[PDB]
Write a protein that binds this ligand. Structure first.
Ligand SMILES: [Mg+2]
Length: 203
């Protein structure tokens, strides 16, 4: 028996609506997270400065993620990329908001990294996960997607689009690949290995 030695995380209140009430389209996690950022900005509970959009991917665009709703069970979904929201609460504890996880929404950072990401030590190195972390304000200011990656060569939708017009800015109509890329020479934010990501946001 031993004491943990503060309790702020025990009473943490979610920054999102309940999972069921969030804006959500399958296979558009970049936009689902953008909409979570917009919700937080427009409400009076938390500052966006405490929040980050997190792109997960790698050079070959094949990342395993466990505890995903698309594949109930103990196996992974292999995504090209996946996007989650990270909130660094004022007490210091980080929380992950993944609308596609079977884990709690939100989920303590350590449990998400241990159960959804898992160690990369026994994974063949080219499948290892990298993390592009963009402050939520910068994400809202700079992200743009014309959804052209979700249409085949005939213009047919690979998955049904979200029910609102494409997110664009004055600078761009499409820069999604600059967020999926894990090359630091591209895009916004910071690119981290798994160990760097856990060092920065873990407890
Ligand atoms: Mg202990």
């Amino acid at each position: 028996q031993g004491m943990e030695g503060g309790p702020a995380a025990v009473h943490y209140q979610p920054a999102s609506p309940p999972r069921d009430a969030c804006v959500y389209s399958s296979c558009y996690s970049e936009e689902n997270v953008w909409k979570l950022c917009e919700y937080i900005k427009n409400h009076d509970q938390y500052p966006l400065e405490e929040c980050y959009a997190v792109f997960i991917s790698n050079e070959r665009k094949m990342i395993p993620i466990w505890k995903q709703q698309a594949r109930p069970g103990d196996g992974p979904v292999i995504w090209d990329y996946h996007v989650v929201l990270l909130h660094v609460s004022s007490g210091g504890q980080s929380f992950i908001y993944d609308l596609d996880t079977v884990l709690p929404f939100p989920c303590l950072f350590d449990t998400y990294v241990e159960d959804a990401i898992k160690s990369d030590d026994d994974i063949h190195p080219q499948f290892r996960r990298k993390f592009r972390v963009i402050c939520a304000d910068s994400y809202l200011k700079n992200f743009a997607s014309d959804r052209s990656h979700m249409k085949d060569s005939s213009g047919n939708w690979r998955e049904p689009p979200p029910p609102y017009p494409c997110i664009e800015t004055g600078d761009s109509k499409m820069n999604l690949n600059d967020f999926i890329s894990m090359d630091p020479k591209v895009g916004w934010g910071a690119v981290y290995t798994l160990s760097e990501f856990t060092h920065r946001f873990g407890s």
